[PDB]
Amino acid sequence: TEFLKPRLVDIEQVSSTHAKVTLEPLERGFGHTLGNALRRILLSSMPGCAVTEVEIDGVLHEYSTKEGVQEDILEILLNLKGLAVRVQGKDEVILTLNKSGIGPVTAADITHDGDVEIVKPQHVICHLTDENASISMRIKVQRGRGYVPASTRIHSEEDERPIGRLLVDACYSPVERIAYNVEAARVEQRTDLDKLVIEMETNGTIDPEEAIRRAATILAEQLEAFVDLR
């Protein structure tokens, strides 16, 4: 036939957050179809790691305060919610943070592990105002996809949790914003092919090429119910 097949040819890295991916050649009308399908998949079904459970010594609930800490425990949990963590081997990781002194607390102060990658070591997490003030915190990170409120996890798990097991909402999806545009591909004997450029902006923990590969695999898996099942 006269059909042509898309090929991933260029991965332009604007920065550690912004990425450009080019796909070509594309036939008439396939650019927008593939772009919209890829955008709907990438914004909804990309796995990622997010902070889900935080334990702090001497703290019973999230509506209390600790001496020497400038902000409140709610602010601590909201700062934890925006932690960009990448886990290679396993799916559930316990993280430990210990700090004592005067000055801001960043993600670099977490006791680093061999299988945990911290994207932003300068991401501030807490502020200490008293030299004798010390903060010890245990952070639990699982891996998942989508958005999980604090009700589903407690409903699903039936075991009792001790007082102080502070639960935070998990935003597993690492993709923040993507967009695409279609231009004209350059072929010497075919001046009608199109080229698809997909712009992706996210935190770390996701390589753009592997994300697009995952989206293609899931789309093909979904279509597998249509290829032969009528």
Binding site: I154, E160, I163
Partner: protein, 50 residues
Amino acid sequence: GPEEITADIPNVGEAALSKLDESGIVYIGAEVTGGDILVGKVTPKGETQL
């Protein structure tokens, strides 16, 4: 008779009493859902027809 506040409550499983201390008061910071017992109160029961 005077009413008493206690964790000793008839025909209630220990699961509902897990969030109460020995004095019958829920601990501070204990997550509680609808229907749980925040404080166990016992009132003397009058004579009942059988």
